[PDB]
Amino acid sequence: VGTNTGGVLVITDTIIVKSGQTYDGKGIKIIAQGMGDGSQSENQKPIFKLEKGANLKNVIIGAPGCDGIHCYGDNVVENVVWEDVGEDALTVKSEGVVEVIGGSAKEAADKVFQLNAPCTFKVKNFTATNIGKLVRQNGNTTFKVVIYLEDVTLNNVKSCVAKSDSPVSELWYHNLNVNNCKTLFEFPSQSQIHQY
Ligand SMILES: [Ca+2]
Ligand code: NA
């Protein structure tokens, strides 16, 4: 695929991507050291910190997945492959639009995507296999998120596709394929879920 395909970049601290920047790995795989083991422990660093307005593309995140990507809003994450999700794959930490486009995630013991601030969260052209949950809004929070799942294929989902404890949140899906999943959506009311 890209010119860095077959190279492995070993890091020992979070890669910070600045507002208005695009980090383009060109197919590089990233392996983090001393930042986490990819377990469910809470004491782990993100591989990437995407400030507001920062973008990320064309990276493979190898094990250990540590705490994945931290997004501070208005970010695009294109063609990112998590080969072995760590504590979680991506976390929305501050408000704005975040779009995951292309790529894949496998082997998430619990959540893939964690939403900890009001946001518009899009997952597009994306495959995930062997996961607990694809999207979680932070537990017991009642701020509003709006999730879009568009051309998403999921295989082996232990808990559900998406969970939220917020009655004002919404999920919209279009061309969603799901195999071997306990239950699709855990929201206060199933009327919060829509197709388009
Ligand atoms: Ca894992
Ligand atoms: Na996390």
Identify the CATH number of the domain in which residue 136 sits: 2.160.20.10
Q: Do residues 128 and 151 lie in contact, with contact meaning Cβ atoms separated by under 8 Å?
A: no
The method recorded for this entry reads: X-ray
Distance CA 186, CA 188 (A): 7
Question: Is 106 annotated among the ligand-binding residues?
Answer: yes
Going from the Cα of 183 to the center of ligand 2, the distance in angstroms, rounded, reads 23
Give distance in angstroms: CA of 164 to centre of ligand 1: 22
Closest-lying ligand to the alpha carbon of 85?
1
Q: Which residues pair with 155 in a beta bridge?
A: 129, 179
Could you tell me the distance, in angstroms and rounded to a whole number, from the CA of residue 64 to the centre of ligand 1?
8
Under a CB-based contact definition with an 8 Å cutoff, are residues 113 and 137 in contact? no
Q: Which residues contact 45 (CB under 8 A, 6 or more apart)?
A: 13, 14, 32, 35, 36, 66, 67
Looking at residue 158, its amino acid is K
Is 138 annotated as belonging to a binding site? yes
Domain that holds residue 165: 1-196
Whose tokens are 């496998």? That residue is: 106
CA of 168 to the centre of ligand 1 (A): 31
Task: Report resolution (Å) to 1 decimal.
Answer: 1.5
Q: Which of 143, 61, 158 has the alpha carbon at shortest distance from 105?
A: 61
Cα-to-chain-centroid distance, residue 61: 12
* The total number of structural domains that make up the chain: 1
CA 42–ligand 2 middle distance (angstroms): 7
